[PDB]
Amino acid sequence: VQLQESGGGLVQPGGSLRLSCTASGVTISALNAMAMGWYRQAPGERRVMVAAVSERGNAMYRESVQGRFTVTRDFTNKMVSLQMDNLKPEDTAVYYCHVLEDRVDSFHDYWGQGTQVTVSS
Amino acid sequence: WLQESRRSRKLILFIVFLALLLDNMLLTVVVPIIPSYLYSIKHEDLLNENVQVGLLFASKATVQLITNPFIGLLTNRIGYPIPIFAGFCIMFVSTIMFAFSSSYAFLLIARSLQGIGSSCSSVAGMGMLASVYTDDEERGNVMGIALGGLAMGVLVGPPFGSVLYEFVGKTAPFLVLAALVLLDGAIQLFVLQPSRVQPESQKGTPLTTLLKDPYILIAAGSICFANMGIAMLEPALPIWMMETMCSRKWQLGVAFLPASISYLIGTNIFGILAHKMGRWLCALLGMIIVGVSILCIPFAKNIYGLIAPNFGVGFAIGMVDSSMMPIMGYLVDLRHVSVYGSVYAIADVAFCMGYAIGPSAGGAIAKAIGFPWLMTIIGIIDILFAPLCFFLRSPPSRLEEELRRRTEG
């Protein structure tokens, strides 16, 4: 199972950006069984979850990102994508792609190449 | 013949149906016969010797209650058919015992073995029925049919025992009943054919985790309270009727007959109605109707006054049971490992706790407190627990809870 993604860039506060992660190396059915989202990491910081989707189509946004982000998973196009409408200087972090597969107890996680976004202050 | 093997999976339905039929037949027939034997033998610590009458019911109830979880573990430990056959043999031995039986202490041992067999059957057969029927609608249908068999057994029991007892004598209702048990065993030995152990392919979730799941607890509490309704109602209705109605002996069976007929009708139609209409909303309506009916029961003043509410309570408890029985399997398949023995053991613990704490506690509450107050408090409990069935509309999956935990930390 291999995945691809594109995005990243420099933008002033208040702008907009679109991020898309592609999963073309695995079949549609196994894609539906799995759960996927977007990771986030900051310099000298641990991973804290921001927004992920599942086969229930329910995305538990983190408490501070509610409304700021917009994520959608395609059951057919094999794409999980993110849309975001506002920027703030506290968004200095690097964003990754990932999947979970909980039919196994180990829930093998496979990461993406990742994208970094920084906001001028 | 008609079944060279499990060509039709409905053969398992028939097995469970007749097993529950015979189990509740044993449960019901001995009830009026125990006091007659006890009085005759006594004629031919006294407070203890009086409350031991209720200890009769308590014996089977508690033995079942204790035995359910061990059988639930045992089923996925070694396989399903072997517990069914063992519970069969234990029930047959107990049935042979009740009759030759005389001594009180031996009769209690006999009915304790009956309880062992009852619990083992009600766990293993139910779990195997769930396992063979992985489809949700078909599982609901077959579970409704099995519960209808339970209700039809508890309806047919008393006259079946009484007619034979009054015609021949002591051992007549028991020997032919044991012969029917033997016929069931003759069917089972070829239908299941457990001549080899079948270890479960997938390990089962720990029982302690299941008790931590809120939705399993909600469904179990729904079943427990709905069954406790009729369980508490069974003892106290005749005594209150004699006290206030100035009634006679023969109205009792006619008065309780609507409840059993409505139970039989409800458990066989709502198995197919619930999936079409919705399990959660069916359970909510069942709880509400239970509450209204039990509230209306004390306010009645004539037998015709009690005809309608008993019909209502039977119908509503039928809805609740036939709609909450398959939701256990649905939940454990949705958000747990696909092993049904433990969850159905929990469900039967909830089922049997009502029969365990019904008679004696209801009698004590009636002794110290007004019987109408007992009915009103039962109705209040049911009505207030009714809205909690709303949470079962769309349970989250295990992946969703994992994502919630990862968002938390």
Numbering used by the authors:
A (entry chain D): 4 to 124
B (entry chain A): 11 to 54, 123 to 487
Article sentences:
Monoamine neurotransmitters such as serotonin and dopamine are loaded by vesicular monoamine transporter 2 (VMAT2) into synaptic vesicles for storage and subsequent release in neurons. VMAT2 inhibitors reserpine and tetrabenazine are used to treat hypertension, movement disorders associated with Huntington’s Disease and Tardive Dyskinesia. Here we present cryo-EM structures of human apo VMAT2 in addition to states bound to serotonin, tetrabenazine, and reserpine. These structures collectively capture three states, namely the lumen-facing, occluded, and cytosol-facing conformations.
Here, we explored the feasibility of a fusion chimera with a small helical ALFA-tag in conjunction with its picomolar high-affinity nanobody, NbALFA, as a fiducial marker. Cryo-EM map for apo VMAT2A was resolved at a nominal 3.6 Å resolution. VMAT2A structure adopts a canonical MFS-fold, with the N-domain composed of TMs 1–6, and the C-domain of TMs 7–12. A well-resolved intracellular linker region between TM6 and TM7 crawls along the membrane plane and connects the two pseudosymmetrically related N- and C-domains. The apo structure was captured in a lumen-facing state, as judged by the large funnel opening towards the luminal space, suggesting a lower energy resting state. Akin to other MFS transporters, the cytosolic gate is composed of residues from TM4, TM5, TM10, and TM11. In particular, the bulky Tyr422 protrudes into the middle of translocation funnel, with its aromatic face surrounded by three methionine residues (Met204, Met221 and Met403). Above this so-called Met-layer, Arg217 orchestrates an interaction network by hydrogen bonding with the backbone oxygen of Ala208 and the sidechain hydroxyl of Tyr418, as well as a cation–π interaction with Tyr418. This Arg-layer effectively seals the entrance exposed to the cytosol. A unique Gly407 residue bridges the two closely stacked layers via hydrogen bonding with the hydroxyl group of Tyr422 and the guanidine group of Arg217.
